[PDB]
Design a protein around this ligand. Structure first.
Ligand SMILES: Nc1nc2c([nH]c(=O)n2[C@@H]2O[C@H](COP(=O)(O)OP(=O)(O)OP(=O)(O)O)[C@@H](O)[C@H]2O)c(=O)[nH]1
Ligand SMILES: [Mn+2]
Ligand SMILES: [Mn+2]
Ligand SMILES: [Mn+2]
Ligand SMILES: [Mn+2]
Ligand SMILES: [Mn+2]
Ligand SMILES: [Mn+2]
Ligand SMILES: [Mn+2]
Ligand SMILES: [Mn+2]
Ligand code: NA
Length: 326
DNA sequence: CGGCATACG
DNA sequence: CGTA
DNA sequence: GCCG
């Protein structure tokens, strides 16, 4: 079992969901308490289980696996022996976990904001609505549309949204393209949002594109919330039969020179990309982001025509998007 | 001991 | 800070 | 929490 998640295939459907979900509760809780290192370990351990070919039935099957130490092993041991881990259940049932999950699920609210509200005694969404002065415009939008934003986005929604984004993009710039990224490109059937990457084959023609796209969407009544810019984290008014629902949509524009790097970064998973960037820097001495791959000693950027090119320049076996579900 | 991904809005 |  |  390779130690980095970018060195192994992780399919969407795997064989250890019970174990991985328990470890991911501990990771989430570690985040709520401000320990990003513990969060990362528990996430990495859960991800290792997703990459295994068969169900773990015996604690012996963990020996030698990366990111399993005393704590993650004890969690698995108790789930195998008893079907429940006391620590996981305590966190699950705790007022702090439940409230931090509730608040951080809001668009515009992260851990530090949720923790402050928790410390102020706030506990419910209605508590927040009762104190609108304490909210940014982004948080106001997140709370206003929270019910819809909690409804899974389905493929039919994606296809309808792709059509209206393509229409606006084509009106704004002939020849520009729209690529579905995020979890749907990895094969997910559902999501919390839809992610789109926009470019143009002629370098530089995409300058100023995203404001023009947003204006065209806003004039068709499709925009409920949005913030020079190249990323827009939006809420769309998606038509439905006889009505509409709010959907989160992320739009990003990249020049075509950067498109493989942006496609790779925005296709995820989040853990896959953090692990790939860690691998790049720590094992290969190269700096990876959604713009490029930089060699800091020659002071040069690697020219890539595809995601495959990037994997190859990092000395990694290529993984298609459906195997990046780390 | 300390690192843990890396950027834009 | 928030978002990805 | 795990690891280089
Ligand atoms: N959520 C999230 N995405 C991130 C982070 N950093 C980062 O590069 N991304 C990239 O943004 C991509 C799209 O983000 P996303 O939150 O829409 O996640 P997703 O489509 O995989 O899952 P979803 O099904 O919940 O929408 C991810 O797939 C990930 O690679 C991060 O900290 N959080
Ligand atoms: Mn399998
Ligand atoms: Mn412990
Ligand atoms: Mn026991
Ligand atoms: Mn998404
Ligand atoms: Mn997104
Ligand atoms: Mn840029
Ligand atoms: Mn330490
Ligand atoms: Mn520690
Ligand atoms: Na949030």
């Amino acid at each position: 079992m390779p130690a980095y998640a970018c060195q192994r295939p992780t399919p969407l459907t795997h064989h250890n969901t019970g174990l991985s979900e328990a470890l991911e509760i501990l990771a989430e809780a570690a985040g709520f308490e401000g320990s990003e290192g513990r969060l990362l370990t528990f996430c990495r351990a859960a991800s290792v289980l997703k990459a295994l070919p068969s169900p773990v039935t015996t604690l012996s099957q963990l020996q030698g696996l990366p990111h399993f130490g005393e704590h993650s092993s004890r969690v698995v041991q108790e789930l195998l022996e008893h079907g429940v881990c006391e620590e996981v259940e305590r966190v699950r049932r705790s007022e702090r976990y439940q409230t931090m999950k509730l608040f951080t699920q809001i668009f515009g609210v992260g851990v530090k904001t949720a923790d402050r509200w928790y410390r102020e005694g706030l506990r419910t969404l209605d508590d927040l609505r009762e104190q609108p002065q304490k909210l940014t415009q982004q948080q106001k939008a997140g709370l206003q549309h929270h019910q819809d934003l909690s409804t899974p986005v389905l493929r039919s929604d994606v296809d309808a949204l792709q059509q209206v984004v393509e229409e606006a993009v084509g009106q704004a710039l002939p020849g520009a393209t729209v690529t579905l990224t995020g979890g749907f490109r990895r094969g997910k059937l559902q999501g919390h949002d839809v992610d789109f990457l926009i470019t143009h084959p002629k370098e530089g023609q995409e300058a100023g594109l995203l404001p023009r796209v947003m204006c065209r969407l806003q004039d068709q009544g499709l925009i409920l919330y949005h913030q020079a810019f190249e990323r827009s984290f939006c809420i769309f008014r998606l038509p439905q039969p006889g009505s509409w629902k709010a959907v989160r949509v992320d739009l990003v524009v990249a020049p075509v020179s950067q498109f493989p790097f942006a496609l790779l970064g925005w296709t995820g998973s989040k853990l896959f990309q953090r692990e790939l960037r860690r691998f790049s820097r720590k094992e290969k001495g190269l700096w990876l982001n959604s713009h490029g791959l930089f060699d800091p000693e020659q002071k040069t950027f690697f020219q890539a025509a595809s995601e495959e090119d990037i994997f190859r320049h990092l000395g990694l076996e290529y993984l298609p998007p459906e195997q990046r579900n780390a």
